[PDB]
Amino acid sequence: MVSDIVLEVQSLHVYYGAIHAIKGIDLKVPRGQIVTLIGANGAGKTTTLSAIAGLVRAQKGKIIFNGQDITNKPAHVINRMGIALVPEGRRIFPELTVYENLMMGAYNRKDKEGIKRDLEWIFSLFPRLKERLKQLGGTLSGGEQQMLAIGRALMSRPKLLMMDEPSLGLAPILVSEVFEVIQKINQEGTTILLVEQNALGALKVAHYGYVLETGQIVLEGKASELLDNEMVRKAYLGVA
Numbered sequence: 187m188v189s190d191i192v193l194e195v196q197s198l199h200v201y202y203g204a205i206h207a208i209k210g211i212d213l214k215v216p217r218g219q220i221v222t223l224i225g226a227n228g229a230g231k232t233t234t235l236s237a238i239a240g241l242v243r244a245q246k247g248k249i250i251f252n253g254q255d256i257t258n259k260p261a262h263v264i265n266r267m268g269i270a271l272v273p274e275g276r277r278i279f280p281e282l283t284v285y286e287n288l289m290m291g292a293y294n295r296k297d298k299e300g301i302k303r304d305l306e307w308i309f310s311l312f313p314r315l316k317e318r319l320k321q322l323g324g325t326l327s328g329g330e331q332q333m334l335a336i337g338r339a340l341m342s343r344p345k346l347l348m349m350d351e352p353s354l355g356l357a358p359i360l361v362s363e364v365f366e367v368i369q370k371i372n373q374e375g376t377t378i379l380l381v382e383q384n385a386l387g388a389l390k391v392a393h394y395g396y397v398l399e400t401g402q403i404v405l406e407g408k409a410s411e412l413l414d415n416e417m418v419r420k421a422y423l424g425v426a
């Protein structure tokens with residue numbers, strides 16, 4: 187099935203350890219849009235993405251991918267279905283060079299031209315990466331590694347690209363380039379679910395946003411409108 191809503195979370199509840207991390211949230215990520223989930227550290231952003239990816243259990247509610255209930259399915263299955271996740275930590279394989287890291291992303295495509303066009307498309311998106319194609323990973327700057335992690339996910343031609351704090355700890359200029367690349371990716375049609383602590387940057391590129399506070403959504407709406415909301419501005423953008 188193919189839906190206009192690529193991902194829908196319904197009354198999701200997540201419990202682990204001693205804490206009730208997510209307390210019944212609802213979210214929708216429309217096809218071709220960039221949706222962002224923002225909130226302070228510890229709001230439950232990573233947990234939300236983990237639940238969706240099946241890395242943590244959903245005690246209540248459901249996660250629907252293109253109309254199909256994938257609630258609590260095996261993480262490896264959910265990945266094969268088309269949901270790509272670029273977790274926090276710019277996880278990359280340092281022992282493999284930039285080229286190998288990108289290519290391992292298209293391990294299940296069988297494509298011939300597509301893989302070709304996609305590899306070159308990623309080159310225009312990340313000039314600095316092509317500048318160090320034969321170079322190993324772990325020898326690039328965190329900024330470059332972050333860009334490499336994103337490139338790898340792209341080579342799998344994701345039906346849904348999820349990213350957890352893509353700009354965390356980066357220099358202003360890199361933060362700016364991260365968000366610009368996210369926009370370029372979306373302009374090609376890729377649906378994105380972006381989790382960020384940098385609310386300003388996230389809301390500026392997103393179509394829709396959700397504000398998560400202590401496991402619950404307190405506000406949601408068109409991104410441009412959230413930027414003009416007094417509560418968002420004072421609480422997340424520093425305008426008090």
Ligand SMILES: Nc1ncnc2c1ncn2[C@@H]1O[C@H](COP(=O)(O)OP(=O)(O)OP(=O)(O)O)[C@@H](O)[C@H]1O
Binds near residue numbers: 231
């Ligand atoms: N030892 C603990 N004591 C209290 N709360 C804890 C503990 N360990 C984990 N948590 C819970 O973890 C949740 C925060 O982690 P989560 O991964 O959801 O954060 P996040 O806001 O997405 O940040 P990041 O994206 O950086 O991981 C909170 O609900 C917090 O209460």
